[PDB]
Chain A
Amino acid sequence: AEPQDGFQGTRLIPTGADFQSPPDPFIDEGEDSVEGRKVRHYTVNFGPQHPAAHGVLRLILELNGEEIVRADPHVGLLHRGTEKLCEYKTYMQALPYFDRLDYVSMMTNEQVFSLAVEKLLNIEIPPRAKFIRTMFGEITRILNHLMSVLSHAMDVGALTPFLWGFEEREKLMEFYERVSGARLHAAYVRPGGVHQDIPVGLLDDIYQWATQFGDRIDETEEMLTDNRIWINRLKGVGVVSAADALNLSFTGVMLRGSGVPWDVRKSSPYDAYDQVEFDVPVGINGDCYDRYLCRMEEFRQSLRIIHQCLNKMPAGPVRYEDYKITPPPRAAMKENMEALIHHFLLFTKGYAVPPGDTYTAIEAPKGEMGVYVVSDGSERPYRVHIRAPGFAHLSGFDHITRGHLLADAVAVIGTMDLVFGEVDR
């Protein structure tokens, strides 16, 4: 009989406090005396004006000398109301909003929204689209790890690998511009497949880059992996146990670094990841050094997947073949009545999506990215909620940093793959 039952406050609702069980005491392991003197902490604001590791980050820390007492990240400096805007857009019009969430991982961001909409559309995309999206997925994973690992290396003082690897970014950004017409915000992966087919000379150009990328990974490992300064900066820093990582909502490398073998591409396969072979790097100490080694090995497995996609690329259409969902080819639209109508309706009204809801998750470069979409049967989504892995990771910053040195905070900010378009949305 809520909420009038609350008008006069009967039957308080049970909290988690009302279910605290006393531990079993048998097996439970857990004057002007100067010991009673209190210690005053000083509270320091870090960011966003004063330089931080990266992004729009106001990090408010309570310190005891050099040690972190409380860590309090203030976010929303990049909260742009993306989730509300999506309710005033068609599904086509909302797709570019996903490029701008994790804005170094554009195609996998648009991949997760395409898969969720495809699920409510009840359509199976063509095999060539599946292989193109998987291929661009691992190209985007390398682009992300190049940004993440190297800028994390640059934050702790290692200038040079960032320069070397961003030329690799330039080469892979050319592939993004060749398929779409953009360096970053491709809007390439759409529900139904991909916008347009790849130009006839792209696969060989990707292959030529693939023959030399292993050396680029190796030269990066020459400066960091065995370097004793790098090890002393990362080993034993930002430790989280396997049990707490699950309870903190950690996904991806932040979870696999603590020993849990789990990859969304393996557990719930999507696109063509069931048709490709790859290994999952897993750490054992749950620290920044293990997470660095997992990400370096993910470079090699991504390249290994890309080579398989180059050889397994099938022929056929790249867009689902129903002009009620995907736009017809321009020659069809100018030729026959049916195609022109379907072109007109898809670009003014949009396609109608059957009502319902779904939670769809992928293994994004920064961990489990998910999207929760509610369809009301119309051409605009009723609700779009985005699950960003960086949001859960930064929410754990206090748990992993309390009691530790202020001089290790830059290491764990970089060990979390943190882009604040993901965090704030």
Chain B
Amino acid sequence: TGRPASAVMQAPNRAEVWSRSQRPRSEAMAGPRFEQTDFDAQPRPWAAIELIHKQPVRWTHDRIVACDGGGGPHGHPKIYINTDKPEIATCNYCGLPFANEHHRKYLESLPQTSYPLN
């Protein structure tokens, strides 16, 4: 029921679904109920998965890093992240990337990373 890009794109900043059980917008907004409708007027929030991966890697020398979202009481419960593996460590609440400085040369060697590194 949708020709325009608002009716096909999963989000303005991402064409594709980001979970296996996610219904593609093209099939979700199809059928009789979407016939005489403005599609740009429909709610289409930006995909959070694309936005969090623009966040640069917060480098640290310490092995363990605390993350609470940065709002103090306005964030998430404080958790502690281990950066000892040679990879980008990510907060399981807010998705923020963290990496140890010991792994900077190997991470810079990597062809493509999950996070910009800069």
A and B touch in the complex (CB under 8 A): yes
Does B76 reach chain A (CB closer than 8 Å)?
A: yes
Set of chain A residues within 8 Å of B75, measured between Cβ atoms: 334
Does A335 reach chain B (CB closer than 8 Å)?
A: yes
Does B32 reach chain A (CB closer than 8 Å)?
A: no
Set of chain B residues within 8 Å of A156, measured between Cβ atoms: none
Q: How far is the CA of A331 from the CA of B77 in the complex (A)?
A: 9
Number of A residues with CB within 8 Å of any CB on chain B: 6
| Chain B min CB distance to A342 (Å) | 13
Give A312-333 interface residues, CB cut-off 8 Å to B: 330-331, 333
Set of chain B residues within 8 Å of A331, measured between Cβ atoms: 73
Closest to A337 in B: B77
| Chain A min CB distance to B31 (Å) | 35
Set of chain A residues within 8 Å of B78, measured between Cβ atoms: 334-335
Set of chain A residues within 8 Å of B77, measured between Cβ atoms: 333-335, 340
Set of chain A residues within 8 Å of B68, measured between Cβ atoms: 334
| Chain A min CB distance to B84 (Å) | 23
| Chain A min CB distance to B92 (Å) | 14
| Chain A min CB distance to B39 (Å) | 35
Closest to A340 in B: B77
A26-43 to B contact mask, C-beta < 8 Å, 1/0 = 000000000000000000
A330-358 to B contact mask, C-beta < 8 Å, 1/0 = 11011100001000000000000000000
Q: How far is the CA of A330 from the CA of B68 in the complex (A)?
A: 13
Closest to A339 in B: B77
A255-293 to B contact mask, C-beta < 8 Å, 1/0 = 000000000000000000000000000000000000000
| Chain B min CB distance to A346 (Å) | 16
Q: How far is the CA of A151 from the CA of B76 in the complex (A)?
A: 49
Q: How far is the CA of A333 from the CA of B68 in the complex (A)?
A: 12
Q: How far is the CA of A330 from the CA of B73 in the complex (A)?
A: 7
| Chain B min CB distance to A9 (Å) | 63
Give B26-78 interface residues, CB cut-off 8 Å to A: 68, 73, 75-78
Q: How far is the CA of A331 from the CA of B75 in the complex (A)?
A: 10
Closest to A343 in B: B77
B69-112 to A contact mask, C-beta < 8 Å, 1/0 = 00001011110000000000000000000000000000000000
In the complex, which of the residues B68, B73, B75, B78 has the most CB atoms of chain A within 10 Å of its own CB atom?
A: B73
Other than A333-B77, A335-B77, A340-B77, give 7 A-B pairs with Cβ distance below 8 A: A330-B73, A331-B73, A334-B68, A334-B73, A334-B75, A334-B77, A334-B78
Please list 7 pairs of residues, one from A and one from B, whose beta carbons are closer than 8 Å in the complex, sorted by A's number. A331-B73, A333-B77, A334-B73, A334-B75, A334-B77, A334-B78, A340-B77
Chain A interface residues toward B at CB < 8 A: 330-331, 333-335, 340
> Top 5 closest A-B pairs, CB basis?
A334-B77, A331-B73, A340-B77, A330-B73, A334-B78
